[PDB]
Tab-separated table of C-alpha atoms and ligand atoms in Angstrom:
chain	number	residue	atom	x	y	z
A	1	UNK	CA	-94.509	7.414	5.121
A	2	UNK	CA	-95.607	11.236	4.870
A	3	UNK	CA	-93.681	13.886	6.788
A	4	UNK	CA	-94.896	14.901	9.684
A	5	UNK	CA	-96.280	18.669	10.191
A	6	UNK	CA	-93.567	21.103	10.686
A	7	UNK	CA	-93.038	22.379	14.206
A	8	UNK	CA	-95.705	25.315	15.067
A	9	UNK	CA	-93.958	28.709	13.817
A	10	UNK	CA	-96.531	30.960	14.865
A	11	UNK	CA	-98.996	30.756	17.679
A	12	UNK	CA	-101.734	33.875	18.303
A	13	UNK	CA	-102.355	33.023	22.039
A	14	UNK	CA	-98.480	33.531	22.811
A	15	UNK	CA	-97.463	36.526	23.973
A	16	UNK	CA	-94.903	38.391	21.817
A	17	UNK	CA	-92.273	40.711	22.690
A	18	UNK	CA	-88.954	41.716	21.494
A	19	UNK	CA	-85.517	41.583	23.275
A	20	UNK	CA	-81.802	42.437	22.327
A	21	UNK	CA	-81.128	39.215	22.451
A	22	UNK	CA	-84.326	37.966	20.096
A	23	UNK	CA	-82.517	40.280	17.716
A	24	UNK	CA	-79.139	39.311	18.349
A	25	UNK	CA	-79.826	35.693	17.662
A	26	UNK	CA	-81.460	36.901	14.383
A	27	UNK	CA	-79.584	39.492	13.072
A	28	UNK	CA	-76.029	38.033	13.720
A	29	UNK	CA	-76.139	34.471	14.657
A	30	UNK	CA	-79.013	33.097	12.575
A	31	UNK	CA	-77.483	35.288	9.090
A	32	UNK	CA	-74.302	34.595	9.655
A	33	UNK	CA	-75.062	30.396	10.194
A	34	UNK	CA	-77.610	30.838	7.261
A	35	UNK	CA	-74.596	31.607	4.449
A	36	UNK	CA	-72.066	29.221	5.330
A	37	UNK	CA	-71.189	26.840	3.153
A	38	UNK	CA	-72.612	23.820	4.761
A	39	UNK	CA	-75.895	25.240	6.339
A	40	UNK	CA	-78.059	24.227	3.226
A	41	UNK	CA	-79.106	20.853	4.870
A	42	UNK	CA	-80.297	22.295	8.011
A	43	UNK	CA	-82.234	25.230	6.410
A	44	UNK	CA	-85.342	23.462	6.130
A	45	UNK	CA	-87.222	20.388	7.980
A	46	UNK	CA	-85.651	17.108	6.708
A	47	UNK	CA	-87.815	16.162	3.603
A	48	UNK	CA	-87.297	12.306	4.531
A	49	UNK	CA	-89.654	11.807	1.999
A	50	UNK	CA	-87.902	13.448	-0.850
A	51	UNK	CA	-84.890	11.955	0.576
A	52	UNK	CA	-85.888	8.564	0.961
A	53	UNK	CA	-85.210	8.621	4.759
A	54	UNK	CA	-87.811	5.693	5.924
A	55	UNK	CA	-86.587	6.089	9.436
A	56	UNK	CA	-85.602	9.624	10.198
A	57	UNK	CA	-88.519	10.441	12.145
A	58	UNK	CA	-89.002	7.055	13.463
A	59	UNK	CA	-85.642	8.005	15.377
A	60	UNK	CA	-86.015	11.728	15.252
A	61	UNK	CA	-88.988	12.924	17.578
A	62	UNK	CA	-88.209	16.249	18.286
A	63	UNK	CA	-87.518	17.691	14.809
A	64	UNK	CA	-85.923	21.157	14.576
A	65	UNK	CA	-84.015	23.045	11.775
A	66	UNK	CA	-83.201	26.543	10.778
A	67	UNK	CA	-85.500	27.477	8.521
A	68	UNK	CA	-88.452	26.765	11.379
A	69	UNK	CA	-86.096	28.694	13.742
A	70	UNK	CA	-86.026	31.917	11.502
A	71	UNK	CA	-89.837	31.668	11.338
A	72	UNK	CA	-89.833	31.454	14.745
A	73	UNK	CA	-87.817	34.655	15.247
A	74	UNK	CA	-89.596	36.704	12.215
A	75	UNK	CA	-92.979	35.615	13.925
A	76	UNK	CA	-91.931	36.633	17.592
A	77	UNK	CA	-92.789	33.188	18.635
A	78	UNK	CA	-89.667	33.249	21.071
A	79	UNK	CA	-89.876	34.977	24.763
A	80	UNK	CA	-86.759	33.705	25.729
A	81	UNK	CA	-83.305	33.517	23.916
A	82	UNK	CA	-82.857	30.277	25.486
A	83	UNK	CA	-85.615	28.828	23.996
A	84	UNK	CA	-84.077	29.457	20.306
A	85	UNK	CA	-80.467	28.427	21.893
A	86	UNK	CA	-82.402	25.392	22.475
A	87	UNK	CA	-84.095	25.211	18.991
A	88	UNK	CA	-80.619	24.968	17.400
A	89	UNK	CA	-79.296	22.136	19.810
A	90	UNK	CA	-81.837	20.016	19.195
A	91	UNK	CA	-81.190	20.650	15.562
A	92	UNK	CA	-77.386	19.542	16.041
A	93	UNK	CA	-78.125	16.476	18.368
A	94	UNK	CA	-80.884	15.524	16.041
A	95	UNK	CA	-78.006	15.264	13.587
A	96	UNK	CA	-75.703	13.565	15.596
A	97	UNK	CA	-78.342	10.901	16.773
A	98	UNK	CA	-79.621	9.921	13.182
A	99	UNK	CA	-76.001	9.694	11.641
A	100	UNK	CA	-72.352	8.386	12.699
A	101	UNK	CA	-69.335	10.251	13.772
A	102	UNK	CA	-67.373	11.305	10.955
A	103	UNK	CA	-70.232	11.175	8.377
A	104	UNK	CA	-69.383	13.862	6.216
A	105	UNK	CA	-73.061	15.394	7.440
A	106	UNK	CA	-72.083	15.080	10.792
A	107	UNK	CA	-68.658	17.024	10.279
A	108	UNK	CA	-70.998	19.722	8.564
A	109	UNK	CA	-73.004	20.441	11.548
A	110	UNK	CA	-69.686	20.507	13.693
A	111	UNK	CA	-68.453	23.125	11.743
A	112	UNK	CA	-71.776	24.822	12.110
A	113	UNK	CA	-72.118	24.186	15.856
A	114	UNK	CA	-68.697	25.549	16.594
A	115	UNK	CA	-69.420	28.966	14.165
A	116	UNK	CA	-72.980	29.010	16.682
A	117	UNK	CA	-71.345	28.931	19.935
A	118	UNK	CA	-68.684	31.625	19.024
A	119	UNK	CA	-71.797	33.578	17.669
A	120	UNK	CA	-73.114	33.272	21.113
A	121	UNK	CA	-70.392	33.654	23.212
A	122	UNK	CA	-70.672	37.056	21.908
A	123	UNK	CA	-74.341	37.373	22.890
A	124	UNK	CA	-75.359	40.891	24.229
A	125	UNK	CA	-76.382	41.200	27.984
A	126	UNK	CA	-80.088	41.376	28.063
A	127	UNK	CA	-80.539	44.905	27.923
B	201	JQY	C1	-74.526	14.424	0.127
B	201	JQY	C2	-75.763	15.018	0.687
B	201	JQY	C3	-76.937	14.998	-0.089
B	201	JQY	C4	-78.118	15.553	0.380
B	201	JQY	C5	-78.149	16.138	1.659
B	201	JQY	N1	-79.328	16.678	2.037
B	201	JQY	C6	-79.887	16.533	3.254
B	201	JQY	N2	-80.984	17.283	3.519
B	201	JQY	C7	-81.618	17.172	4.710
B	201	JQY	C8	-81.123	16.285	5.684
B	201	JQY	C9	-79.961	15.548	5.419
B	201	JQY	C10	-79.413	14.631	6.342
B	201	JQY	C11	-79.373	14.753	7.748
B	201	JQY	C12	-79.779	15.784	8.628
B	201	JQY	C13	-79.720	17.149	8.251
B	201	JQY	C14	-80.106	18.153	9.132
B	201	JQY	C15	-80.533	17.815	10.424
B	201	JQY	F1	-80.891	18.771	11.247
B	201	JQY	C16	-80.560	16.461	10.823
B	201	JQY	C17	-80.196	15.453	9.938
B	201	JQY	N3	-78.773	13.652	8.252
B	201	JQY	C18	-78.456	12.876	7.203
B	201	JQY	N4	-78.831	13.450	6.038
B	201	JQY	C19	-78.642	12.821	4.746
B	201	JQY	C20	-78.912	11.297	4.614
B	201	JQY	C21	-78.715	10.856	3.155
B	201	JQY	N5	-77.325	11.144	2.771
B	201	JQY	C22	-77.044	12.598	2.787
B	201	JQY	C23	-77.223	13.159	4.220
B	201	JQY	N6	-79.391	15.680	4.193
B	201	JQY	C24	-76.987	16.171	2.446
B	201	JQY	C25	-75.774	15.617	1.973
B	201	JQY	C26	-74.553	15.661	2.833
């Protein structure tokens, strides 16, 4: 099986705008996710081709990762914050629905989840 198309990064009918939040959630939480040491999995979409993954998007349906997420915010697709907060947990329950507790991938994107939700606990009132 192919891959399927990424998820749509950039849409010219959408309106754009820009928020302290937008750049929050790229400045601080999406940089500071993006060098950790176990981020390099989700920093792309899942190549289940390259990685032999037959089934991955026979179980995954909504596919989301951080590399389509950073589009996203470099392209102003985003309106909302919440729809980004949203972007990254679908990435970590994709995760968590393909693999097992305690699979070492799954303890990555724990560590990663927990590092994201302390990044936005300390997300700036909209201004
Ligand atoms: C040792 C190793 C070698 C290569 C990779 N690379 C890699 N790249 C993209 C995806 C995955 C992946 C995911 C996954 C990742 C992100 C996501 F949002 C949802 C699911 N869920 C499972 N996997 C692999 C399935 C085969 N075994 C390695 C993990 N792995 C990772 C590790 C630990």
């Amino acid at each position: 099986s192919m891959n399927p198309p990424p998820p749509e990064t950039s849409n010219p009918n959408k309106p754009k705008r820009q928020t302290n939040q937008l750049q929050y959630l790229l400045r601080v939480v999406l940089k500071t996710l993006w060098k950790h040491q176990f981020a390099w999995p989700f920093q792309q979409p899942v190549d289940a081709v390259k990685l032999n993954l037959p089934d991955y998007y026979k179980i995954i349906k909504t596919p989301m990762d951080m590399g389509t997420i950073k589009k996203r915010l470099e392209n102003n697709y985003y309106w909302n914050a919440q729809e980004c907060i949203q972007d990254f947990n679908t990435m970590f329950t994709n995760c968590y629905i393909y693999n097992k507790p305690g699979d070492d991938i799954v303890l990555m994107a724990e560590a990663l989840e927990k590092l994201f939700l302390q990044k936005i606990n300390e997300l700036p009132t909209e201004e």
